[PDB]
Amino acid sequence: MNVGTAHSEVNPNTRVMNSRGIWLSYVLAIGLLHIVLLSIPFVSVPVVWTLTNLIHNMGMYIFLHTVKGTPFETPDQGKARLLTHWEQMDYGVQFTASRKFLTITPIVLYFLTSFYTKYDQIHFVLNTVSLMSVLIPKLPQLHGVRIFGINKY
Amino acid sequence: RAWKQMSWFYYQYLLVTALYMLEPWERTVFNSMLVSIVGMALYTGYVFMPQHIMAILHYFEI
Amino acid sequence: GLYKRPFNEAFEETPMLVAVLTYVGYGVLTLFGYLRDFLRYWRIEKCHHATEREEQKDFVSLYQDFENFYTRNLYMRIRDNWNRPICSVPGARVDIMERQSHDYNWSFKYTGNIIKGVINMGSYNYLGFARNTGSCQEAAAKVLEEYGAGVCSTRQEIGNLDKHEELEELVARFLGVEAAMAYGMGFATNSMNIPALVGKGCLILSDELNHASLVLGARLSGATIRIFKHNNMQSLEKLLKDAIVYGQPRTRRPWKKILILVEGIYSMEGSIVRLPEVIALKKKYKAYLYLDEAHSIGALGPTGRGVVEYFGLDPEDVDVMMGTFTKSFGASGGYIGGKKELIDYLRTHSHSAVYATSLSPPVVEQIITSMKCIMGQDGTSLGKECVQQLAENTRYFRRRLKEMGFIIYGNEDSPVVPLMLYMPAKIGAFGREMLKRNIGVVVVGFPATPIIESRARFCLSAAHTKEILDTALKEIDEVGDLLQLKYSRHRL
Amino acid sequence: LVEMVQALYEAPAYHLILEGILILWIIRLLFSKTYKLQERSDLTVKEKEELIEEWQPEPLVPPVPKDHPALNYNIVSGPPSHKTVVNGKECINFASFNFLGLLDNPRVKAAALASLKKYGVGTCGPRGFYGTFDVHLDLEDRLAKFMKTEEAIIYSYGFATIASAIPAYSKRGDIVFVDRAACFAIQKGLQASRSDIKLFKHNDMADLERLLKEQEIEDQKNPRKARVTRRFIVVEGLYMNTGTICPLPELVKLKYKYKARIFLEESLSFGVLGEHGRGVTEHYGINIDDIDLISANMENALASIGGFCCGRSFVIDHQRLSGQGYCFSASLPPLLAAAAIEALNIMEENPGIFAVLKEKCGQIHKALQGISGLKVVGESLSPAFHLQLEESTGSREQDVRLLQEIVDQCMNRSIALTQARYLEKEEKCLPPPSIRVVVTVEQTEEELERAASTIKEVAQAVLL
Amino acid sequence: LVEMVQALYEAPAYHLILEGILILWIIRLLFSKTYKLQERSDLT
């Protein structure tokens, strides 16, 4: 369908994270990923937890801070052809329940995966690097800024 | 009667998992991944997890 | 705002599990779309798409590929629901040419046979004026023989005729306003008359579910646009208060004007605007009202005078009354009604008044004949039975559908009936299974709507007999059992 | 410095992390550009209500003078055709854009009547929802075959054709090089899209070259942005405001030299120019494939309501899903489409009527030359041209009044003329007031000579 | 409870300092009631 047939909003994308049941689906997706990773027979539990953390963080980074634009043609004439999804969310309003939830969840996952890996240092460096790679773009300061001009266009 | 019910349940699985609109080979890919995951999960459950759920399943069957 | 009649509407929220399954389906479709894009990128699979000519490979690519994502991956899979050619008058029964595709909907080819006697729930003929054999068609043929089809000049130039003046007088009498003007397109009405009324430095408070014509008309003018929630009088009042109090954003000056854009009946939602509240707030805060009556000008009201007749309000309260003859009267056109000074200023300073051709002569005759039939000037009891029949059909259809366990949006008196499917695959499934049972419906998917809310809209008519409604209801119930579309907690 | 590093390495971890957070605090303070006063004041409710009651809105419509000429509309008591009746006076039509004279062709009326009996008047829906008839597909195929292009799309309103075709392809951040004297439809199309508009002089390829070279320099400044910016050149085949043709070959060469696509508007030239009436492309012989998109309307030459855009499938297939006037509006009534198809058949049958129109335009253009107070603006091949004031007064109102006086005197002399109308405030480049003259294959030579004599005498009398 | 306390006591100190500052960051996020519009406007 065409954008605007049943709703006046020029950019539906901005609201996809405020819909009914998106949070529970996201949490259940994380849970299903963890179950699938635990399913592997020859892999130890700390490795399973660190794999869960790394995979979830990489996917979240790709979907929220890398892919820019919209998957559908929008009738505001390409205003967001350069913005990523995190910048598009809620039309740039910086603090909102959705953004708070999306920032909080990786930290809780980090606590859990740190405890279940018995605080091993080799796992610690990877988990902290991944958590920082996710949490750094979430800052309001890094809104519409690209370091060394990567992913500008 | 049973075969019709199984066909209807497969139809509902297709509608829910959005495989209805996908091409046949995409359905094959998704089904193969799903069956592989389920089988490997059951093998891991048998090897490591205690077979207490096995006794419950046997009692339910009996 | 006082309601002389009860105002009942029900927008039931989606079941939770249904939402979870909807997101599962959309995630699967997104992942397989990414896979297909990667396969086509390395030319591993041949793509059935047109490409730019060899001389222009140096040029910057015309389209951005990511914008077409949902076109290639989701829309193409169920493209056969939409753009269905027909070969008959769009009455209660329409004849659909049949087509088949062996390239998974990338290319279509027409089989020889045509499907006949399809119950038509997609067309807009609320009062059933779409008849190839009737008095209106005789008058249209009589005018077509003499005046010819089409006028070749603008209204301000020699293109003005007597037929247009007669139609304008008739419309002015019909609505009850002092004067009215008629345009050749319903879209053009808004797009070329909203910029004239309001310019830069003014405020346009727009509803959350306005048509694309109203949004485009607001965007063309330089006015500031703010959006309030759909029929949320608290939100409208809050925006009015803040706009009056805080003034313009950059420089705190009072606004030159405040204009409120609303519609009579919203098509996809099915709700009716809370007119008394809007009028009360408009009077209280000294704003102006633009009322789009495309859907409510023929369907609503004891005599089909509009939505103001339905609510019992005074037509002099609404400042601008836009309307369209396409839906109810069965002929393409548009109009704006209001006070005489408004109409004179629009006749002088309107884009379509100066730069675009006026209406066709046979079409204005069809409009005149249909509107005279509704007025009762003909003297026949026909045209008054149509409104009663449409009201009865709406009551029967809505009640029977609600008592089967479906979810239905909108007011109890709105002819448009949205039925909720909630899932992407169920859109295509419902469309195909309904056509297989000889019923034509309109299904609406994600990018148009919210993500969880995918629907199918039924447009009732006064041409629908009771047997047709019973057949449609039985088939709808069978398909609802087949696809498990009954998501209503209260009834089943 | 090595001893300092060793001592730091021997230091505990908490001390170092505290010093690090202190350094971060120092950076935050040094970059705290904003200065705050801790002064917050909130309006009192009484003051808010006072502001609410004080404000008074402007009237919706400004008071209009009663002297506006456009307020008086000409009332035609019958079909607009040759030997019409304007304002109750019988006149010969020199004002309506009906070049080929197909408005009153009995075959067109018969086809329209047959399709009216078959389908009715209304379509009752968009093209997506049961609003597509077989006549629409037949008309699209007929247009595609006639114009020697792969695909065509039809809109139900002429203005919407280009006003919705242009924004579909041009987005924010792009560059559009549009002629200065372009109709209001193109101006509104360019306003709907948010791209950057560059205006060049009417039919000056020097200015086009200069602007293209400036854009090339700006591209050399930043290659990354220049990789994702598209360039369009929007021109009209036979201009409405000026009545002059455009130089296609130079435009095509500049296209292939500077990588910028071409959008052509052919509202006036669609059915009047070229041996077979295929537009300015046939008149110049330029290949049809060079021009990306060609728009026109079926209202002037074909005598029916609507419009269309034609081209290759690559460009056309986008408008079906991105055109506003197409996606969100009802489809063309079947009788108008049948009339358009019958007119296309008549045009394809005998192609000598284009030659007849050419020779009559030549005769009238030659005869009109010699007015003391009026100058002819246009070209010999144009069917519609302007008569402007040779000596312009100080103000526009007096010019309009003199032209209207001439028009009324001509109307009382059995010649029906109209004056070109514009929105004074909105038009970018506002043309001078002028009397519009339109030539039709219906008008014979003798009527052309008589009209020339009449306008000549009336201009001589009024201007003196 | 007790087992969790013992496991935390067996963790390195810098790890627990990092976790503490992360908890403070979470508290700041929860209590950041103001929704800054994040917009800049300059007069013409």
Swiss-Prot record, chain A:
Outcome recorded upon mutating F63R: Impaired negative regulation of SPT complex activity in the presence of ceramides
UniProt subunit comment: Ceramide-sensitive subunit of the serine palmitoyltransferase (SPT) complex, which is also composed of SPTLC1, SPTLC2/3 and SPTSSA/B.
UniProt disease link: Asthma: The most common chronic disease affecting children and young adults. It is a complex genetic disorder with a heterogeneous phenotype, largely attributed to the interactions among many genes and between these genes and the environment. It is characterized by recurrent attacks of paroxysmal dyspnea, with wheezing due to spasmodic contraction of the bronchi.
Function (record text): Plays an essential role in the homeostatic regulation of sphingolipid de novo biosynthesis by modulating the activity of the serine palmitoyltransferase (SPT) in response to ceramide levels. When complexed to SPT, the binding of ceramides to its N-terminus stabilizes a conformation that block SPT substrate entry, hence preventing SPT catalytic activity. Through this mechanism, maintains ceramide levels at sufficient concentrations for the production of complex sphingolipids, but which prevents the accumulation of ceramides to levels that trigger apoptosis.
Family membership: Belongs to the ORM family.
Membrane-topology annotation of the record: Multi-pass membrane protein
Source organism of the structure: Homo sapiens (Human)
Cytoplasmic side: 1-21, 64-100, 140-153
Domain of life, source organism: Eukaryota
Swiss-Prot record, chain B:
Record membrane topology: Multi-pass membrane protein
Pathway in which this enzyme or protein is active: Lipid metabolism; sphingolipid metabolism
Annotated keywords: Disease variant, Endoplasmic reticulum, Hereditary spastic paraplegia, Lipid metabolism, Membrane, Neurodegeneration, Sphingolipid metabolism, Transmembrane, Transmembrane helix
UniProt-annotated location(s): Endoplasmic reticulum membrane
Residue ranges that the UniProt entry lists as topological domain Lumenal: 23-27
Domain of life per record: Eukaryota
GO molecular function: serine C-palmitoyltransferase activity
Topological domain ranges for the Cytoplasmic compartment: 51-62
Transmembrane segments: 6-22, 28-50
Keyword Transmembrane helix: yes
Site (Within the serine palmitoyltransferase (SPT) complex, defines the length of the acyl chain-binding pocket, determining the acyl-CoA substrate preference): M21
InterPro entries: Ser_palmitoyltrfase_ssu-like, SPT_small_subunit
BP GO annotations: ceramide biosynthetic process; protein localization; sphingolipid biosynthetic process; sphingosine biosynthetic process
GO terms for cellular component: endoplasmic reticulum; endoplasmic reticulum membrane; serine palmitoyltransferase complex
Recorded family membership: Belongs to the SPTSS family. SPTSSA subfamily.
Cited function: Component of the serine palmitoyltransferase multisubunit enzyme (SPT) that catalyzes the initial and rate-limiting step in sphingolipid biosynthesis by condensing L-serine and activated acyl-CoA (most commonly palmitoyl-CoA) to form long-chain bases. The SPT complex is composed of SPTLC1, SPTLC2 or SPTLC3 and SPTSSA or SPTSSB. Within this complex, the heterodimer consisting of SPTLC1 and SPTLC2/SPTLC3 forms the catalytic core. Within the SPT complex, SPTSSA stimulates the catalytic activity and plays a role in substrate specificity, which depends upon the overall complex composition.
Gene assigned in the entry: SPTSSA
Curated annotation (Swiss-Prot), chain C:
Annotated membrane topology: Single-pass membrane protein
Essential cofactor(s): pyridoxal 5'-phosphate
Keyword set, alphabetical order: Acyltransferase, Disease variant, Endoplasmic reticulum, Lipid metabolism, Membrane, Neurodegeneration, Neuropathy, Pyridoxal phosphate, Sphingolipid metabolism, Transferase, Transmembrane, Transmembrane helix
Modified residues (N6-(pyridoxal phosphate)lysine): K327
Tissue specificity of this protein: Widely expressed.
GO CC terms: endoplasmic reticulum membrane; serine palmitoyltransferase complex
Domain of life: Eukaryota
Keyword DNA damage annotated: no
Induction: Expression at protein level is highly increased in brains of patients with Alzheimer disease. No changes are observed at mRNA level.
Sequence intervals crossing the membrane: 15-35
Subcellular location: Endoplasmic reticulum membrane
Effect of L74W: Some decrease in catalytic activity with L-serine and palmitoyl-CoA as substrates
Main location: endoplasmic reticulum
Any one GO BP annotation for this protein: adipose tissue development
Effect upon mutating A130P: In HSAN1C; reduced activity with L-serine as substrate; increased activity toward L-alanine resulting in the accumulation of 1-deoxy-sphinganine
CDD domains membership: KBL_like (cd06454)
Its EC number(s): 2.3.1.50
Effect ascribed to mutating I78W: Loss of catalytic activity with L-serine and palmitoyl-CoA as substrates
GO molecular function annotation: pyridoxal phosphate binding; serine C-palmitoyltransferase activity
Pfam families assigned to the protein according to its UniProt record, in alphabetical order: Aminotran_1_2
Mutation effect (T326A): Decreased catalytic activity with L-serine and palmitoyl-CoA as substrates
Family: Belongs to the class-II pyridoxal-phosphate-dependent aminotransferase family.
Name of the protein this chain belongs to: Serine palmitoyltransferase 2
Origin species: Homo sapiens (Human)
Curated annotation (Swiss-Prot), chain E:
UniProt induction comment: Expression at protein level is highly increased in brains of patients with Alzheimer disease. No changes are observed at mRNA level.
Effect recorded for Y14F: In ALS27; increased production of sphinganine and ceramides, when expressed in induced pluripotent stem cells (iPSC) differentiated into motor neuron-like cells; decreased response to inhibition mediated by ORMDL3 and ceramide; no effect on the interaction with ORMDL3
Tissue expression per record: Widely expressed. Not detected in small intestine.
Residue segments, region Interaction with SPTLC2: 1-44
Transmembrane annotation, as ranges: 7-27
Secretion signal, residue range per the UniProt entry: none
Location(s) in or outside the cell: Endoplasmic reticulum membrane
Similarity remark: Belongs to the class-II pyridoxal-phosphate-dependent aminotransferase family.
Domain comment quoted from the record: The transmembrane domain is involved in the interaction with ORMDL3.
The protein's assembly and partners: Component of the serine palmitoyltransferase (SPT) complex, which is also composed of SPTLC2 or SPTLC3 and SPTSSA or SPTSSB. The heterodimer consisting of SPTLC1 and SPTLC2/SPTLC3 forms the catalytic core of the enzyme, while SPTSSA or SPTSSB subunits determine substrate specificity. SPT also interacts with ORMDL proteins, especially ORMDL3, which negatively regulate SPT activity in the presence of ceramides. Forms dimers of heterodimers with SPTLC2. Interacts with RTN4 (isoform B).
Record's protein name: Serine palmitoyltransferase 1
Species this protein is from: Homo sapiens
